[PDB]
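[SOLVED] Need 3D model of a two-part complex

Original post:
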Amino acid sequence: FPSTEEEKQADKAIKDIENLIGESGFPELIENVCSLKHEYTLIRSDFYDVITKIQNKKISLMKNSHNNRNKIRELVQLQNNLKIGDELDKIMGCIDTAEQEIRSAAFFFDEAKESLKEGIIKRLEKSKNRAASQLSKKALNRAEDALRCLENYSSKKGEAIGRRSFIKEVVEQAKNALSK
Amino acid sequence: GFFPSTEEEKQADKAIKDIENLIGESGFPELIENVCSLKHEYTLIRSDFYDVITKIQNKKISLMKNSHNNRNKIRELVQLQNNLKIGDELDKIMGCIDTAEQEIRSAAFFFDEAKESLKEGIIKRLEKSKNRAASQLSKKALNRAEDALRCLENYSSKKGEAIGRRSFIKEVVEQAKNALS
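Solution:
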């Protein structure tokens, strides 16, 4: 059992992460990220459904181009402003970063759990040129790193929800300008 | 026209409409959800794999109380642990799925570009003064539609390979659990 202080320190950090992520672990957090990729596609879908409607109206108005001279431009100027693809990009970016940090956190978390236990085997063997404490230090500062990655994850996931709610409203607005 | 009338427009139009029929309505959203689900499965097998390694490492600690009389039973666990390279199939699966994710994502991005370009080329045709531009767009449309189909091909080969690798490691892991009993 964890005895060397350094082990109880590595131990308590592992338990922090376990309680933080809960009974369902990194797989749960991966699924949270999947769900976001789902949100992303649907809002990309809604965005391009709107471009399509603008283009189909333009074509329809091009029957009498000159007469509809201002109305084409409003839809020209609608499409250019509704060129918010750099916000869709930013959401993609945020999501990609998040799924990155949950793979770093999972890999690091395992590295730490595996390292504490090698640490305890090394001490049970009395093979003590600190090799025991070296594993138990690597363990703590793999936990720290897993917690770092869970930190950045939470930031980027939030930015995603946020950016997505902004563009979803800009799309629904553009959409309900056309439906009349 | 006031519709796809040009030969390159009609070809670009057919290609796009073949994708729509091939994958069905909401086909991209659904295809993205499938790999994401498969990724979920992968991380559950990865989590089992690590839970086994932990089961092992706890057995060693347990037997270590009596290192002399359990030396051979402990050396057998030092092996089953190293002798895994189930790690070697997990990252291989991870790689497969990441490719499939990137392929289906590119398929949808390209599809959206193809449609977008088709309707801009037809608009630019209807202007009658910009036929060189109305050509590049009907052409861009066609390529991005072909790119899309290529990405669908790649998706289904990488997904297929992922599923084959998924099945194997499940029984390997499931055996490694059983072995500890």
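Edit: The radius of gyration of chain A is 26 Å.
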